[PDB]
Write a protein that holds these residues in place. Structure first.
Motif, mmCIF file in Angstrom:
data_model
loop_
_atom_site.group_PDB
_atom_site.id
_atom_site.type_symbol
_atom_site.label_atom_id
_atom_site.label_comp_id
_atom_site.label_asym_id
_atom_site.label_seq_id
_atom_site.Cartn_x
_atom_site.Cartn_y
_atom_site.Cartn_z
ATOM 1 N N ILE A 73 -17.345 17.411 56.046
ATOM 2 C CA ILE A 73 -16.078 16.866 56.764
ATOM 3 C C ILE A 73 -14.952 17.570 56.770
ATOM 4 C CG2 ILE A 73 -14.426 15.022 56.174
ATOM 5 C CD1 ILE A 73 -17.272 14.015 56.977
ATOM 6 N N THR A 74 -14.637 18.532 55.723
ATOM 7 C CA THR A 74 -13.424 19.229 55.908
ATOM 8 C C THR A 74 -13.121 20.345 56.861
ATOM 9 O OG1 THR A 74 -11.752 20.386 54.456
ATOM 10 C CG2 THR A 74 -14.147 21.249 54.104
ATOM 11 N N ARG A 75 -11.879 20.956 57.047
ATOM 12 C CA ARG A 75 -11.903 21.992 58.202
ATOM 13 C C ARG A 75 -12.298 23.624 57.782
ATOM 14 N NH1 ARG A 75 -9.904 17.053 57.922
ATOM 15 N NH2 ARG A 75 -8.146 17.850 56.832
ATOM 16 N N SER A 76 -12.352 23.447 56.369
ATOM 17 C CA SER A 76 -12.892 24.666 55.749
ATOM 18 C C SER A 76 -14.437 24.989 55.952
ATOM 19 C CB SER A 76 -12.368 25.051 54.471
ATOM 20 O OG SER A 76 -12.978 26.111 53.931
ATOM 21 N N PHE A 77 -15.210 23.832 56.453
ATOM 22 C CA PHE A 77 -16.547 23.719 56.309
ATOM 23 C C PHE A 77 -17.345 24.635 57.159
ATOM 24 C CE2 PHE A 77 -20.449 21.584 58.027
ATOM 25 C CZ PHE A 77 -21.016 21.678 56.921
ATOM 26 N N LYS A 78 -17.992 25.560 56.671
ATOM 27 C CA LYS A 78 -18.593 26.673 57.427
ATOM 28 C C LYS A 78 -19.902 26.683 57.029
ATOM 29 C CE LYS A 78 -14.980 29.920 57.711
ATOM 30 N NZ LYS A 78 -14.711 30.031 59.224
ATOM 31 N N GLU A 79 -21.017 26.715 57.861
ATOM 32 C CA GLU A 79 -22.547 27.020 57.689
ATOM 33 C C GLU A 79 -22.841 28.218 57.926
ATOM 34 O OE1 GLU A 79 -23.879 23.875 60.208
ATOM 35 O OE2 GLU A 79 -23.812 22.164 58.598
ATOM 36 N N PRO A 80 -22.940 29.038 56.869
ATOM 37 C CA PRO A 80 -23.482 30.377 57.147
ATOM 38 C C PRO A 80 -24.972 30.355 57.011
ATOM 39 C CG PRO A 80 -21.888 30.356 55.443
ATOM 40 C CD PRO A 80 -22.113 28.959 55.538
ATOM 41 N N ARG A 81 -25.548 31.610 57.270
ATOM 42 C CA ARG A 81 -27.017 31.914 56.980
ATOM 43 C C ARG A 81 -27.129 33.285 55.989
ATOM 44 N NH1 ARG A 81 -30.424 32.593 60.724
ATOM 45 N NH2 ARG A 81 -32.374 31.424 59.967
ATOM 46 N N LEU A 82 -26.028 33.628 55.844
ATOM 47 C CA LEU A 82 -25.960 35.058 54.897
ATOM 48 C C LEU A 82 -24.365 35.002 54.580
ATOM 49 C CD1 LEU A 82 -27.424 37.553 53.752
ATOM 50 C CD2 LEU A 82 -26.617 38.831 55.582
ATOM 51 N N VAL A 83 -24.176 35.590 53.254
ATOM 52 C CA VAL A 83 -22.908 35.869 52.460
ATOM 53 C C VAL A 83 -23.052 37.233 52.050
ATOM 54 C CG1 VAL A 83 -21.511 35.209 50.609
ATOM 55 C CG2 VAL A 83 -22.066 33.478 51.992
ATOM 56 N N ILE A 84 -21.821 38.144 52.245
ATOM 57 C CA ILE A 84 -21.923 39.383 51.832
ATOM 58 C C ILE A 84 -20.742 39.398 50.871
ATOM 59 C CG2 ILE A 84 -21.997 41.753 52.283
ATOM 60 C CD1 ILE A 84 -22.953 41.093 55.094
ATOM 61 N N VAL A 85 -20.622 40.248 49.718
ATOM 62 C CA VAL A 85 -19.784 40.004 48.649
ATOM 63 C C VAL A 85 -19.401 41.345 48.069
ATOM 64 C CG1 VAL A 85 -19.159 39.185 46.469
ATOM 65 C CG2 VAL A 85 -20.583 37.624 47.775
ATOM 66 N N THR A 86 -17.846 41.706 48.132
ATOM 67 C CA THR A 86 -17.577 42.947 47.574
ATOM 68 C C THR A 86 -17.594 42.971 46.220
ATOM 69 O OG1 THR A 86 -15.193 42.171 47.348
ATOM 70 C CG2 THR A 86 -15.931 42.989 49.611
ATOM 71 N N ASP A 87 -16.965 42.038 45.552
ATOM 72 C CA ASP A 87 -17.039 42.158 44.130
ATOM 73 C C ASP A 87 -17.766 40.745 43.537
ATOM 74 O OD1 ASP A 87 -16.953 42.476 41.143
ATOM 75 O OD2 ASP A 87 -14.529 42.594 41.201
ATOM 76 N N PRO A 88 -19.109 40.663 42.753
ATOM 77 C CA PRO A 88 -19.774 39.413 42.244
ATOM 78 C C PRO A 88 -18.836 38.838 41.366
ATOM 79 C CG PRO A 88 -20.895 41.396 41.827
ATOM 80 C CD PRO A 88 -19.669 41.816 42.802
ATOM 81 N N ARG A 89 -17.914 39.593 40.657
ATOM 82 C CA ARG A 89 -17.148 39.245 39.483
ATOM 83 C C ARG A 89 -15.981 38.476 40.131
ATOM 84 N NH1 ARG A 89 -17.886 39.841 34.432
ATOM 85 N NH2 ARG A 89 -19.153 41.489 34.961
ATOM 86 N N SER A 90 -15.090 39.236 40.996
ATOM 87 C CA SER A 90 -13.922 38.601 41.776
ATOM 88 C C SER A 90 -14.149 37.407 42.675
ATOM 89 C CB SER A 90 -12.965 39.527 42.619
ATOM 90 O OG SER A 90 -12.684 40.682 41.349
ATOM 91 N N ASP A 91 -15.417 37.407 43.474
ATOM 92 C CA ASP A 91 -15.835 36.367 44.439
ATOM 93 C C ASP A 91 -16.868 35.612 43.588
ATOM 94 O OD1 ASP A 91 -14.061 37.776 46.231
ATOM 95 O OD2 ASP A 91 -15.511 38.674 47.175
ATOM 96 N N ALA A 92 -17.005 35.425 42.369
ATOM 97 C CA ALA A 92 -17.999 34.734 41.782
ATOM 98 C C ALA A 92 -18.159 33.325 42.190
ATOM 99 C CB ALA A 92 -17.631 34.763 40.184
#
Lengths: 184, 81, 206, 129, 87, 150
Positions: C110-129
């Motif tokens: 519903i919300t406006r931050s709703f995105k539908e990716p098919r791939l996520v790329i992460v710099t830090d898996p601890r900071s972006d946990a």
RNA sequence: UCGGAUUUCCAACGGGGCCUUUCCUUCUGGCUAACCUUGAGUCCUUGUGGCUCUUGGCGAACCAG
């Protein structure tokens, strides 16, 4: 005295080997001093898939260490004379049958007189003088035993040209299949 | 750690495991041919000698038992096996 | 399934040695000791930068596998990674999420931050946990830039680098950006270095 | 102390399959274990595996594919007769369609359907499906 | 599963995993399907031709999907000198 | 592990995979057997003899170089003692603790340990009395222990 | 072929007797058949061929103790 070193049973190739053996006695003062009482029982000739054949020299048990003093130079000289015959020493170890449920009075059969101990002594002597450092038995998906046997790094080259002959010997004497390997 | 080899471990990692807890168990010890200068003579000594191996002629303690390995005497030639 | 065209470049290797990407973490986890070359006597491990390069190659393959270039999302709450991710997505066509990740961005249709990716790329898996944990619910592959003590839960292809030094982070995003663009066809020749300097992906402050 | 060995073997096999692994190291080994794993390998709940000698009692390295759901032992080895099989296959298997309760008959160790076909019986070791 | 007429009677054949060969079920949302792009001689990705992989939610959740996908890629020749079979 | 205590201690000797003789060892079998007989007439136990053979004389294992163990060889020579070594050292330790309890009447810990040692003696003595290496008349007793050690 | 019938081939499935260094071991007396001594005859391509006896033995079986 080719029938002296044989034992009550002359065979053509046995007379050839014993004749060459007496000739090797005649070319030496001290190898004759050992090899003259050292008799042997018999022979087997079996072909390999590499074009040549191999000779299993069936030797009696209590003299085999005296052979093990001298089998290096003797296999060298017999590979000199009789070409394309890989020279192998195998002892004569009579097995005993395993007693069934209806098994009349027989004494306590030794572990050395069993099947697997005799096969292990066969594999001990086939790769003489090097030592088997390990056996790993591989069971295939279709249930086919392939016995992997590992070898040392001191005496590689004396046996390294005799490998398929050893495979033929072991697949002929018992039908079990075998692979040698020298680990890194 | 899902798919690895245990038949053929890497020799460095296999070198650090405990004596009893290898693939095929076996000792980590060895032997020595030692020579004291006062005899110029080979004495064969085990690396973890539990008694004071004295030389053949002279009363010179070639090694003392201390915990795991035997402490060699000062000024003694040795070589393995 | 790779030509020798894809192999490690001396120029790129000079870049990776200059950025201290090889200087791994102090403590190393269980699942990333394949990526360790050796441990220096001061306690810093060394990252196999050839393994690192070929991991970037496979990650670039995976990024090329998504047809529409918008479903690729780069993620950073790391400060230097904000710069790197923004300029990456600028040169790429992917969409960035710099700074704070809004929870329920991949759930909550519903919300406006709703995105539908098919791939996520992460710099830090601890900071972006939380972005990893959010991607673990809606079937999204996760590419991470893991240092040698980075947690490897719910990750796909993970690139061994140093997430501490900003030169390492900007250069890792730089090399992944250029390799993706070379795989696309906007960088037709392979002999060509990517003309934009790695200083555009490094982080600045007045 | 360590009382059964096939039980410990199937314990380790089942734990490693639960974790999803590919290989196990069984210590020690037995003839019974080898025959059991041959019964497994015949229908192919496992791939190939391998004996290791250390002169004492061997170790085994098993490659396990993905196909094992669960294997286990029945620790008091019960005496079973012919119709009694229809009890245990009603107890342990997940369906009438597959699964193998394995028996130790005087004509060797094998699954229950072969002992239907060979018309023998004996004792019981365990179950595989 | 089929009938006695030899025709299949199932709703769908499930996807199996590749790291552990187990069934990826109809609601494993922690699982993942991976596409790796087939390259050209110039190093361009072929758009519609991929090599696919399946890494289940148990695999991925345990913290193993990186190493296992390295193994699957090097065994399929997409990596080299990364995954060592002996450790 | 460890009856009469709680430890799970593993600390033992390995045994090498090679059955046969060492390569570098170049002595005779009769030489080391005569060495065994010499040390036995010196008055040593087979554990001590094996220790002195691998420390000083480089004789790794008795069953490696020769076909027999040390106890088979001392049995073949009529040098085996009246009781095996382990039962002897257990009775020796029990006599020591018994004398200590005869001095100090208050050490409940020595009493408990003496009970443990006597339990171990009785179990091992049942083992030796089963396999007929000990006469069935034989029984561990207090003054019998004082006779056997002193 | 006037619904079932049994050959050939084919997978299979269990089983028996063997041979690979190896499975029931004997002694003493009677019962069949086969190799040998010995001379005799009925058949057919001239027969130490096939069919049958004559005194003495060996091997594989049948039975008693």
């Amino acid at each position: 005295p080719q029938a002296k070193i044989l034992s009550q049973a002359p065979t053509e190739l046995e007379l050839q080997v014993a004749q060459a053996f007496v000739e090797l006695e005649n070319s030496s003062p001290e190898l004759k001093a050992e090899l003259r009482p050292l008799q042997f029982k018999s022979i087997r000739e079996i072909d390999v898939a590499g074009g040549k054949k191999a000779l299993a020299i069936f030797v009696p048990v209590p003299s085999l260490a005296g052979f093990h003093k001298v089998q290096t130079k003797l296999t060298r000289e017999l590979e000199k004379k009789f070409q394309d015959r890989h020279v192998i020493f195998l002892a004569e170890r009579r097995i005993l049958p395993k007693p069934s449920r209806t098994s009349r009075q027989v004494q306590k059969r030794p572990r050395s007189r069993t099947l697997t101990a005799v096969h292990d002594k066969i594999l001990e002597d086939l790769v003489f003088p090097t030592e088997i450092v390990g056996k790993r038995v591989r069971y295939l998906v279709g249930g086919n035993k392939i016995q992997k046997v590992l070898l040392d790094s001191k005496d590689v080259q004396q046996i390294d040209y005799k490998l398929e002959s050893f495979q033929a010997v072991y697949n002929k004497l018992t039908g079990k299949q075998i692979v040698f390997e020298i680990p890194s | 750690v899902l798919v690895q080899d245990l038949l053929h471990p890497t020799a460095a990692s296999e070198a650090r495991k405990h004596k009893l807890k290898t693939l095929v168990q076996g000792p980590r010890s060895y032997f020595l041919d030692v020579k004291c200068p006062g005899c110029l003579n080979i004495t064969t000594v085990f690396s973890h000698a539990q008694t004071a191996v004295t030389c053949e002629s002279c009363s010179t303690i070639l090694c003392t038992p201390t915990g795991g390995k035997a402490k060699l005497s000062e000024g003694t030639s040795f070589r393995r096996k | 399934s790779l030509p020798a065209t894809f192999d490690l470049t001396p120029e790129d290797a000079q870049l990776l040695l200059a950025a201290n990407t090889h200087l791994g973490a102090r403590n190393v986890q269980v699942h990333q000791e394949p990526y360790v070359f050796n441990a220096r006597p001061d306690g810093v491990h060394v990252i196999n930068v050839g393994k690192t390069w070929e991991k970037l190659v496979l990650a670039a393959r995976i990024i090329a596998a998504i047809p529409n270039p918008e479903d690729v999302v780069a993620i950073s709450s790391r400060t230097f990674g904000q710069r790197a991710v923004l300029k990456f997505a600028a040169h790429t066509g992917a969409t960035p999420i710099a700074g704070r990740f809004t929870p329920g961005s991949f759930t909550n249709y519903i919300t406006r931050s709703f995105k539908e990716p098919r791939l996520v790329i992460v710099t830090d898996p601890r900071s972006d946990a939380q972005a990893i944990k959010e991607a673990s619910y809606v079937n999204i592959p996760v590419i991470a830039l893991t240092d040698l003590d980075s947690p490897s839960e719910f990750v796909d292809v993970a690139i061994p680098c140093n997430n501490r030094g900003k030169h390492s982070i900007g250069l890792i995003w730089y090399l992944l950006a250029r390799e993706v663009l070379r795989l696309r066809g906007a960088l037709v020749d392979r002999t060509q270095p990517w003309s934009i300097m790695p200083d555009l992906y490094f982080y600045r402050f007045p | 102390t360590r009382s059964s060995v096939l039980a410990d073997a199937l314990n380790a096999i089942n734990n490693a399959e639960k974790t999803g692994k590919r290989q196990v190291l069984i210590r020690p080994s037995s003839k019974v274990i080898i025959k059991f794993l041959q019964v497994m390998q015949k229908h192919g709940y496992i791939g190939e595996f391998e004996y290791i000698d250390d002169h004492r009692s061997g170790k085994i390295v098993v490659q396990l594919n993905g196909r094992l759901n669960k294997c286990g032992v029945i620790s008091p080895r019960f005496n079973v007769k012919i119709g009694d099989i229809e009890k245990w296959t009603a107890n342990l298997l997940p369906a009438r369609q597959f699964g193998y309760v394995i028996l130790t008959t005087s004509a060797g160790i094998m699954d229950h359907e072969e002992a239907r076909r060979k018309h023998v019986s004996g004792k019981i070791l365990g179950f595989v499906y | 599963m089929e009938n006695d007429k030899g025709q299949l009677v199932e709703l769908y054949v499930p996807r199996k995993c590749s790291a552990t060969n187990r069934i990826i079920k109809a609601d494993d949302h922690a699982s993942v399907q991976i596409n790796v792009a087939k390259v050209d001689e110039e190093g361009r990705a072929i758009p519609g031709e991929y090599v696919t992989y399946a890494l289940s939610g148990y695999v991925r959740s345990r913290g193993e999907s990186d190493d296992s996908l390295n193994r699957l890629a090097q065994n399929d020749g997409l990596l080299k000198n990364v995954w060592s079979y002996s450790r | 592990g460890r009856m009469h205590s709680a430890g799970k201690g593993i600390s033992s000797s390995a045994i090498p995979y090679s059955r046969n003789a060492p390569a570098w060892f170049k002595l005779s079998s009769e030489s080391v057997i005569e060495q065994i007989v010499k040390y036995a007439r010196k008055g040593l136990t087979p554990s001590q003899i094996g220790v002195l053979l691998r420390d000083a004389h480089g004789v790794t294992q008795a069953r490696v170089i020769t076909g027999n163990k040390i106890m088979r060889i001392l049995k073949s020579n009529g040098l085996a003692p009246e009781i095996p070594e382990d039962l002897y050292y257990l009775i020796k330790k029990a006599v020591s603790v018994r004398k200590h309890l005869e001095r100090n009447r208050k050490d409940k810990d020595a009493k408990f340990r003496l009970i443990l040692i006597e339990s171990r003696i009785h179990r091992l003595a049942r083992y030796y009395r089963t396999v007929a290496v000990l006469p069935p008349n034989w029984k561990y007793e207090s003054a019998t222990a004082s006779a056997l050690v002193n």
